[PDB]
Amino acid sequence: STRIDLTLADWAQQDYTAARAAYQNVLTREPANADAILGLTEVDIAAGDKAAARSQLAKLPATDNASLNTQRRVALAQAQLGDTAAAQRTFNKLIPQAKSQPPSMESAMVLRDGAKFEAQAGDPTQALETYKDAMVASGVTTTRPQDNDTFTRLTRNDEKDDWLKRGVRSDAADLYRQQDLNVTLEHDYWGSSGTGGYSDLKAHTTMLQVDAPYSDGRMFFRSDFVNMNVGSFSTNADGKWDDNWGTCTLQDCSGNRSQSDSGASVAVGWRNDVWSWDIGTTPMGFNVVDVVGGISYSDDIGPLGYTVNAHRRPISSSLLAFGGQKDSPSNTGKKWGGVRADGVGLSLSYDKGEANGVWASLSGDQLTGKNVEDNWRVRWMTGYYYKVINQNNRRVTIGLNNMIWHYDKDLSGYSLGQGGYYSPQEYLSFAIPVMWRERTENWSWELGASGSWSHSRTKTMPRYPLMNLIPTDWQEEAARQSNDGGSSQGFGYTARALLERRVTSNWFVGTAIDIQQAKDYAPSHFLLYVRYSAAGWQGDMDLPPQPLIPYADW
């Protein structure tokens, strides 16, 4: 029977061979069956046979009289087959007809996919109007939302609604947020303990970001002002010090007792659901400035979602690594530092919304700087998390993470020729993160903690690898000094807290605390940020809150 033969083929797709055979079987009894040929085309293009599908679709009878559901499928197929004009005219004919009819599932789907197509067609405003009409059609609201506030508040999530209403809400909210214009200003105070003069780091960073829509994506302009202070050297006597910094180990230094520097950087970039790219500069005003940037591509493969990126970034772990330092004017006066890491990375993830989720990442970078020994690194990271609580407004998870690092050379020292950044020969870390995210009508927050165990080893390294920089007289001394290697393992912990409050439709404020004690020498951060939305966002806030990230940390 035609009905059951059609049903058997259709049930699979909500899958190729059986459905195609069933559709062909219906084609024997009734060669003019429009639904059978539509299903055959759908299954063919689901297999990626676009070239055959576009030829098959032309065999359908004319649209002299057909239901809205069939015309919606035809329009979607034509749009995805690459014939945008026929789909555009079909939707232009369909949408007023959908509006004229009372609220129904057919008309709701027609308006939803029409809004989606119009958003892809290059008319986001008409897409927003069509979404406004679709919410009326889908039963979300009895009356059309006349202003941005009532339009946005209807997009808040609902636990009792069906799939159609939830999809309409999610799509309307996503499009509205994509079309919004945002201005964010954030202040970061960060640093870590160390030795005064080269490692007693305290830094301030003021970040200004403008986010605007462009095509289906968003473009961003970013400006960063960063000030780094590392204290002053402790003089032993006669106004001289002999710390393990620069060439002071060969001759007691003088002159540059205090060390600090500030600079401004710019960045411009763009990002969409698939592609992302960004280019900018190292903060101008430091000793050494280099151009940095990155590009990234993301796509789904099977059940997994993968991302491949290539980037060049600075290292902000210390002043010598980020902006570089100058040797004391009494000994050499030469400039050195400014380590840049350029390389590639590939990441995979799996999360279908259920209780379990996994992710992994691998990266390979080359580290090169001004008068700094060349280096390279390979890094592996992975994580798994089980969601104890997985409500749409409240998530509580506990998981296990693993990290493995290897570096070619250990250049953690601050002597001339070394970059002063952490670089172990073999590092392993296992952590157990516990996380809780929640949001309310006007409050959103995230709390996180993690205990970890880490092992690290570093090899013996010469103190002055760049022998040509050392003066001829000190040569015999410089070859006789080396930094002793060693291995160490132990426990550590990290904690984080994010909070965000909506005080006005166009005004959001938030604070973030990041404490690092996992024996990784990472600096601790404390930031306050304010965000202004031109159109206003009265719907559900971000979960978690999403503060800005310093451009040097990308």
Author numbering: 602 to 615, 618 to 1157
From the paper:
Phosphoethanolamine (pEtN) cellulose is a naturally occurring modified cellulose produced by several Enterobacteriaceae. The minimal components of the E. coli cellulose synthase complex include the catalytically active BcsA enzyme, a hexameric semicircle of the periplasmic BcsB protein, and the outer membrane (OM)-integrated BcsC subunit containing periplasmic tetratricopeptide repeats (TPR). Additional subunits include BcsG, a membrane-anchored periplasmic pEtN transferase associated with BcsA, and BcsZ, a periplasmic cellulase of unknown biological function. Cellulose is a common bacterial biofilm component produced by a variety of prokaryotes, such as Escherichia coli (Ec), Salmonella enterica, and Gluconacetobacter/Komagataeibacter xylinus (Gx). These Gram-negative bacteria synthesize cellulose and secrete it across the cell envelope via the Bacterial cellulose synthase (Bcs) complex.
To gain experimental insights into the architecture of full-length BcsC and its interaction with cellulose by cryo-EM, we reconstituted the protein into a lipid nanodisc in the absence and the presence of cellotetraose. The obtained cryo-EM maps underscore the high flexibility of BcsC’s periplasmic domain. At lower contour levels and for the sample devoid of cellotetraose, the cryo-EM map confirms the solenoid architecture of TPR#9–19, while the N-terminal eight TPRs are insufficiently resolved or absent in the experimental map, Fig. 4a. Although the density cannot be identified unequivocally as a cello-oligosaccharide at the current resolution, its shape and interaction with BcsC are consistent with it representing a cellotetraose molecule, perhaps bound in different binding poses. Supporting this interpretation, no additional density at this site or elsewhere is observed in the absence of cellotetraose in a map of similar quality, Figs. 4b and S10. The cryo-EM structure of BcsC reveals that its periplasmic domain is flexibly attached to the β-barrel.
